Amino acid sequence: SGFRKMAFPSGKVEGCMVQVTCGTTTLNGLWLDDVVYCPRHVICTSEDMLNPNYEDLLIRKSNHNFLVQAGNVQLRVIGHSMQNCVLKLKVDTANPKTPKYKFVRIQPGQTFSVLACYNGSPSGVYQCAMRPNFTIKGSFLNGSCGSVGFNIDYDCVSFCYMHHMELPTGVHAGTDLEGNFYGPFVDRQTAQAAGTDTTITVNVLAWLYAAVINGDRWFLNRFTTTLNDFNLVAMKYNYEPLTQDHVDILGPLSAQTGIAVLDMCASLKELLQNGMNGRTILGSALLEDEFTPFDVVRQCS
Amino acid sequence: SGFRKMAFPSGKVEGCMVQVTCGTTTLNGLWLDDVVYCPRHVICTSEDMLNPNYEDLLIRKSNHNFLVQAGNVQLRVIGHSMQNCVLKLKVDTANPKTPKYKFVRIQPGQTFSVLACYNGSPSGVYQCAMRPNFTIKGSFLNGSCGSVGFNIDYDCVSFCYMHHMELPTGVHAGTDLEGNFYGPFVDRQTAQAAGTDTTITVNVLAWLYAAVINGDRWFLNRFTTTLNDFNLVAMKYNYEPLTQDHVDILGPLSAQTGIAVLDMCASLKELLQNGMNGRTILGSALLEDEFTPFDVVRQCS
Ligand SMILES: *[C@](O)(C(=O)NC1CCCC1)[C@H](C[C@@H]1CCNC1=O)NC(=O)[C@@H]1[C@H]2CCC[C@H]2CN1C(=O)[C@@H](NC(=O)C(F)(F)F)C1CCCCC1
Numbered sequence: 238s239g240f241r242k243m244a245f246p247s248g249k250v251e252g253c254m255v256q257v258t259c260g261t262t263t264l265n266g267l268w269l270d271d272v273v274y275c276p277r278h279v280i281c282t283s284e285d286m287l288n289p290n291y292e293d294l295l296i297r298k299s300n301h302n303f304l305v306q307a308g309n310v311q312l313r314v315i316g317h318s319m320q321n322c323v324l325k326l327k328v329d330t331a332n333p334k335t336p337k338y339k340f341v342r343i344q345p346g347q348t349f350s351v352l353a354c355y356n357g358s359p360s361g362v363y364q365c366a367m368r369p370n371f372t373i374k375g376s377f378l379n380g381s382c383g384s385v386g387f388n389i390d391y392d393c394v395s396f397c398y399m400h401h402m403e404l405p406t407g408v409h410a411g412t413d414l415e416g417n418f419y420g421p422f423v424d425r426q427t428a429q430a431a432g433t434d435t436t437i438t439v440n441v442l443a444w445l446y447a448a449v450i451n452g453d454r455w456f457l458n459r460f461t462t463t464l465n466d467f468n469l470v471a472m473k474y475n476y477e478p479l480t481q482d483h484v485d486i487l488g489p490l491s492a493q494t495g496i497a498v499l500d501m502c503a504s505l506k507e508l509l510q511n512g513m514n515g516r517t518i519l520g521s522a523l524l525e526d527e528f529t530p531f532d533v534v535r536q537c538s
Numbered sequence: 539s540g541f542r543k544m545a546f547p548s549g550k551v552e553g554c555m556v557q558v559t560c561g562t563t564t565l566n567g568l569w570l571d572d573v574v575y576c577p578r579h580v581i582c583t584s585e586d587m588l589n590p591n592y593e594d595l596l597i598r599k600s601n602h603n604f605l606v607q608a609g610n611v612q613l614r615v616i617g618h619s620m621q622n623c624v625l626k627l628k629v630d631t632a633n634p635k636t637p638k639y640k641f642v643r644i645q646p647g648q649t650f651s652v653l654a655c656y657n658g659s660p661s662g663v664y665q666c667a668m669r670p671n672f673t674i675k676g677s678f679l680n681g682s683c684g685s686v687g688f689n690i691d692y693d694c695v696s697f698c699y700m701h702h703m704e705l706p707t708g709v710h711a712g713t714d715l716e717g718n719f720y721g722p723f724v725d726r727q728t729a730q731a732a733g734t735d736t737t738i739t740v741n742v743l744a745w746l747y748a749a750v751i752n753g754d755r756w757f758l759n760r761f762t763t764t765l766n767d768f769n770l771v772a773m774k775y776n777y778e779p780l781t782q783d784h785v786d787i788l789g790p791l792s793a794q795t796g797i798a799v800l801d802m803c804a805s806l807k808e809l810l811q812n813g814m815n816g817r818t819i820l821g822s823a824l825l826e827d828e829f830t831p832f833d834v835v836r837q838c839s
């Protein structure tokens with residue numbers, strides 16, 4: 238039945254995307270009820286960005302310094318406040334398309350959908366993982382700032398990411414919707430570096446189970462192993478240690494396939510030690526770590 | 539800035555997805571104006587599907603044999619007709635969320651976004667290519683039938699795919715919105731086979747340009763080649779021949795990077811002849827053929 242990098246349907250979030258302008262700076266905002274959330278660096282000039290004092294920069298602004306456009310209609314700003322690295326703009330109209338929503342802070346290894354936006358206009362949607370080093374491997378150009386990441390459980394949108402910056406390795410960094418950065422990054426145009434990344438082991442194992450459920454079995458073997466002996470090989474290949482919490486989460490997939498977790502661990506070990514020898518798994522020549530156990534169950538129903 | 543398999547925002551299509559039930563068969567339909575489009579096999583029992591006569595099966599049905607649910611509201615059917623492999627259900631309410639739309643039949647090598655749907659509820663969105671053998675490498679379970687594929691240009695949705703079936707290789711087949719199958723497939727549970735697939739050469743070249751635009755340059759070389767000598771190596775690696783039409787389409791990417799098309803061809807030749815030697819391009823260990831030149835320009839702005 239097949240296995241694809243699948244994003245959440247983006248309709249509930251499209252209806253919240255607006256354009257926020259302050260002087261010559263234009264980026265994207267999220268309009269929920271009578272509040273528009275955007276990156277605070279909207280109030281910055283090129284010069285300010287080298288070493289901004291945001292509190293100073295903001296006390297020098299008024300409501301009228303902020304143009305908020307929902308498509309054609311201009312929303313009148315009637316209030317502003319900063320929360321960490323996000324600006325909150327109180328507007329005179331509650332968004333009639335406000336979905337059921339929450340603000341959630343995701344953990345490294347968890348996945349979410351990104352709605353790339355330019356000038357408040359949705360451009361595309363794709364799935365990302367919060368990397369262990371708190372970066373995301375996104376696709377973001379100038380104008381993307383204020384684009385959000387989200388999960389949809391039932392009809393409730395859980396917002397977990399707002400886009401702020403690109404690092405020199407070509408990966409991306411931003412905040413939760415309360416304005417707290419993921420990882421040790423700051424909203425200043427200064428030399429900053431992604432820390433060394435690791436492979437999300439539990440997600441590789443989840444993807445191996447997805448493979449089996451779709452009829453790729455070539456990489457399986459009769460062997461098993463212990464959490465301990467497996468984790469020695471993980472250490473060696475720059476893979477996150479696997480925990481009992483990780484084995485427990487892989488349970489439903491373990492049952493559905495009848496392959497024990499520590500049996501599937503023995504498969505990963507041999508793949509790590511010998512490579513794939515010109516073969517592929519779910520159309521990849523690399524071990525994929527951007528599917529969670531939940532993503533695999535969800536998609537393989 | 540990064541490169542991702544990116545789907546169109548799915549909002550305009552979510553607002554068109556309905557559930558169609560006929561007896562015990564439930565699948566998805568597309569509600570545009572006062573018409574609901576769905577797979578004609580909705581009128582089939584398990585038994586009928588082994589060798590249906592659809593004309594017969596349909597003449598034995600009335601408007602009242604079709605329950606159409608848009609979320610919680612039931613739409614009253616006031617007409618029905620078959621067009622090839624699609625059923626058209628005239629309903630008593632024009633869809634207030636009908637976007638600007640077209641029905642288009644796409645060519646092999648072209649891409650589109652799929653909104654996977656179950657019980658008329660959007661489940662996920664992802665990008666697909668119409669393969670040269672007229673299959674798509676989708677992710678579709680029982681209940682997916684009636685799920686649509688589409689491109690969005692300006693605010694106009696061009697619908698190009700409706701889902702009908704899975705082939706034994708685990709790839710998928712269906713129709714345009716006028717009910718004509720892509721490829722030599724029929725809507726009957728009988729032994730049918732995907733033909734041998736080729737790699738979309740123009741899309742691999744487009745993806746190499748995307749690579750250069752994002753700073754992957756390792757695979758470039760000083761050499762060039764001719765269309766003919768390149769096509770000799772394409773033949774050998776099960777790659778579609780490249781045409782002047784393909785070279786012309788790659789022009790804007792050729793210009794933007796200053797790498798001539800036949801220069802980038804000499805790179806593909808060496809990648810085909812010697813492989814990648816443990817290196818990756820845009821995070822893939824395989825040559826990717828599901829990005830069009832348009833997809834690369836659009837995303838790499
Ligand atoms: C974002 O602000 C944006 O989209 N703003 C638009 C409105 C005004 C101009 C465009 C922008 C998004 C990135 C641009 C390229 N790809 C992106 O994802 N972010 C930034 O430009 C961001 C600002 C805001 C906080 C810090 C500064 C600098 N910055 C960066 O992304 C830079 N990164 C760094 O300085 C650092 F080293 F990572 F810290 C990039 C440096 C290379 C060139 C592109 C920007």
Ligand SMILES: *[C@](O)(C(=O)NC1CCCC1)[C@H](C[C@@H]1CCNC1=O)NC(=O)[C@@H]1[C@H]2CCC[C@H]2CN1C(=O)[C@@H](NC(=O)C(F)(F)F)C1CCCCC1
Nearest residue numbers: 564678679680681682683702703704705725726727728730
């Ligand atoms: C689709 O009709 C559906 O979703 N309908 C729902 C309502 C009733 C039950 C589910 C369904 C979608 C596929 C099922 C698995 N994944 C899919 O993409 N299509 C079919 O089942 C389709 C019907 C309609 C036209 C032909 C028959 C048979 N069929 C198939 O997909 C089978 N393929 C073939 O018979 C053939 F060889 F390709 F010709 C599949 C065979 C094995 C896998 C399950 C069905």
